[model samples]
Target chain A: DLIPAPPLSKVPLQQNFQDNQFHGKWYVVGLAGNRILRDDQHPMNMYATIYELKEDKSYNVTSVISSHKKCEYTIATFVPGSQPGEFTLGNIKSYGDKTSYLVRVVSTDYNQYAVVFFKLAEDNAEFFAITIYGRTKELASELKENFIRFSKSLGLPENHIVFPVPIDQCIDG
Target chain B: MHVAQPAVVLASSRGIASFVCEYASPGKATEVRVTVLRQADSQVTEVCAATYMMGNELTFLDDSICTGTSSGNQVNLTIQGLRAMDTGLYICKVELMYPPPYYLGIGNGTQIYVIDPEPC
Candidate 1:
């Protein structure tokens, strides 16, 4: 018999998340999982993520990656999910199905930080990508540990949790 | 068709810096505009800009020191032999021309930071 996957804890997903507060630029402080970081370049760590919410409830996302060897940019429009704080990313129209992003937590003032978890369900395997985002490049010590614990609860290995290089400045619009 | 541009970029002194803005659609864009701006304090100067109306012309300001190239639906900006004084914020603005009325569709644009190299 096929075994079913465990259910997700209800605590992770926020209820009635304010979309307006989620808009703006966010720095990538930490990330876990092999799927998102599989590229080996370790790009997202040095770049910030920008989010622009449209009137129709879609999101415009822009991210940049730079290094001594090369520089790259990725932009995508994420449509609203079935529920609040959920979003569909990637080439959904062309790929039929794509990855999903769930906003886990955010400060009430929107000046602190946030947590976003990604889920990719494949035929026989399931992959999860957990990311810690901060208003600034630097994150509070307490929040860093809490982010790690959150990833561990999601079944991510402790070794998998990696801290990205802090980015002080970037060339961007 | 949707266009995507870099929101941030970076490079070290004396390093080759580059940024490419892409537009993804079935057909190639009829016109492309690439602009680079150097932000110092409160001053916003147009370092470079090339419009499709001006025969895809590229103009570099007196203080601007970079090169730009456009092909298909993508515009590329390249900077060579970066200097330490060049350590500042740079913005890459891209505009694509489609049809009438809807002259251009602007991508989110890219922010670049040029920094100094680390010492031993």
Candidate 2:
């Protein structure tokens, strides 16, 4: 029998955090479907990487961002660490201040796309989709393109994702 | 010291039994290390647990990620090795090491019930 493909939830990550954070590093995208928007009205996509996955069906994520020189980093943890997929993305590690993040969902497909939502705050369901990331950058591009196509198919503007990124980043909020 | 999140559901002090907890985080392996301590009168009592290291030797249970069904929201932890003297506050600590490393602490005192298992 063929070895079962790794769960989509287990896929390790490697992505572009935009040009600003884009030293070939990962950055959160945004969430999908319904969620509460932040009071600042800015989306939570920019803070994507913090909402990581764990194996116990929970998540551990950090909110502290370490910025020195022209670099920035965060220290966080996640639950439900993996779901078995082509790749198994492990937890994150860093050093600096202190903060936390929480998880939301994983793609059922175990493919290159899924929904990653972060809490707006401890009391709100307000969230944003970080990404529908793929196993590779090429795959991510492909998935984003497909997402855009699907959005257009649903009557949403293609430029819906072409807007300015959000600033207010909170895990519980 | 503090039961932090609402995810941790049921906590009991009975040694050799099970405890249920709930939490929300990532979907990966997060280490769960447990400790039990009892504070009565002016004295402090502490108990350290030995976890099976997947080998023959027993080492103190350290951090190991809680993943899959347990990490999502609800899950149970079964702890064995009990005696009437083993009664006190049991702390359930969950840490996430996959996406990163973060410590989550759940505090509760459990009273052990000394009784042998009935015939199955």
Candidate 3:
């Protein structure tokens, strides 16, 4: 179900976000978005995003994204907002109306998992994208359930949620 | 080759994190490779790979980011000064070459998460 976008101004974001602690790699486990193309039987290419802390407290996000046929590397930048854990993701792909992202929940030890939310407001059609990122390919069942519950709370339908296959194999250079 | 199962690891921020992979074959291994991969948007990045022949380091890829050390059948991958960006699933892949046939072994996959000092 396509979710009507939430008010950009009213969307909740993380506070006191720590750049160094958030820097590193994260695997995309569960994905849900109003604008997402859902396919349960067709497995999506697995990937992880690496964030590097910048001198100015910004971040450089590097990821190697793969599709069924090919894979490519992409780089994006996130500039911190006035609030912590809130950022304006730049160089976003043109597939949807993604405007910004927020770190909703993260493990205290920075070793388990984190939840990220993307919001988009296009004309009268709004979209909310939720991504579950973990340190490993397989996360705890409770954590995965937590993400499912969280997405439902944000008005995403159950059918919209998709867990992509983990990228376990790759072409050696 | 025998890699670890349910291969997931966790480390704190600015802490040390490591994972191991192993291979057991009938014949002497001509060469062994241990590598790590990160999933990006539509591509997978080879973070680092180390080749060992007879338990000696042959060639290492991405030595600047990570390092691989082998002891017998085990190859350990270690990362120091861990950061949040270092959190994610790492594939510990081992390839062994013995005579005419080659065997490939993969760990379940190590998922790493770096916790923040404060939970918000």
Candidate 4:
């Protein structure tokens, strides 16, 4: 598992991604490749997140992370890339003031679900996460299977892939 | 001023499970509140909570399905007809009311596994 993830160059982006249609709420139902983005002692559950399209072609992002006795909030701005489904996210309060992320929307239907990839690098540190988002809290069994299948294709082993439990804590946030 | 909880519990589906959180809030702790949360790996949900005041009765989050009670320095959360979704880590917390100089305590928590029922 320490061989390292495939380079970002090999991953494809959403074809002709529709930024306008992408605005709305999403539930991150399946998670994988977050080994770099997390600490072994603390794990986070993504309840829900919102993507608000700004006039500047960027997105105002907010994610509600439900945790012990409290609901955690994350705010960030997604600056669009030259491609529709591509974006450079940065200026995150949680990710610190200097960190930036290379975000790629691997696949999306604009209405049902989306598979996205995130990468962050700093000095000797490298972090990334593979996520599958659904319109609702639940996804079909087939979709769940597909997520695992896709993750394995990226060199991730069965142990690295995780299907987190559904939560209703701060979905509205 | 401190809370205590078990390390783990394996439960059966459709069965019942009780979680105990003990805390000793000594001195002028004033208002004391207890909370229990369900942590599934990284995601978390508030299971239930109870607050105690000197003259006020206990205020709780839920009255059925998931219920909580306090005796002495211990708070207990009981779940009925457990479901697979209920399988996760249960964390207990105690907080003393204050604008400042308040006391907050967190327990180590209990890992609850609602294992699959015997398949026929």
Give the candidate number with the greatest lDDT. 4
Chain B structural similarity (TM-score) per candidate: 0.57, 0.46, 0.72, 0.75
How far does residue A35 in candidate 2 sit from its true spot (Å)? Answer: 15
Q: Global lDDT of each model?
A: 0.55, 0.34, 0.59, 0.67
Residue ranges of candidate 1 with Cα displaced over 4 Å: A1-6, A34-45, A69-71, A97-109, A169-173, B1-120
How well does model 1 score by local distance difference test? 0.55
lDDT of 1 by residue, B7-43 (tens): 6667655555787766432122223456666666656
Score residue B3 of candidate 2 by CA lDDT: 35
What fraction of the true interface contacts does model 3 reproduce?
0.00
The parts of candidate 3 lying over 4 Å away from their true place are: A7-12, A68-70, A91-109, A170-173, B1-120
Q: Candidate 2 residues B1-120, lDDT tens each? A: 123322222323333556554433323223333333444453554444332211123245454212112433434445555544544444443322233222233344444444434446
Poorest 10 consecutive residues by lDDT, candidate 1 chain A: A35-44
Error of 1 at A91 (Å): 3.6
Error of 3 at A44 (Å): 1.8
- What range of 10 consecutive residues in model 4 chain A has the weakest lDDT sum? A34-43
Pairs that collide in candidate 1 are A170-B112, A170-B113, A171-B111, A171-B112, A171-B113, A172-B110, A172-B111, A172-B112, A173-B110, A173-B111
DockQ of each: 0.02, 0.05, 0.01, 0.05
DockQ-better candidate, 1 vs 4: 4
Q: TM-score of every model?
A: 0.50, 0.29, 0.51, 0.55
How many backbone overlaps does candidate 3 show?
32
What's the lDDT of the predicted structure labeled candidate 4? 0.67
Provide the clashing-pair count of each candidate structure.
10, 87, 32, 5
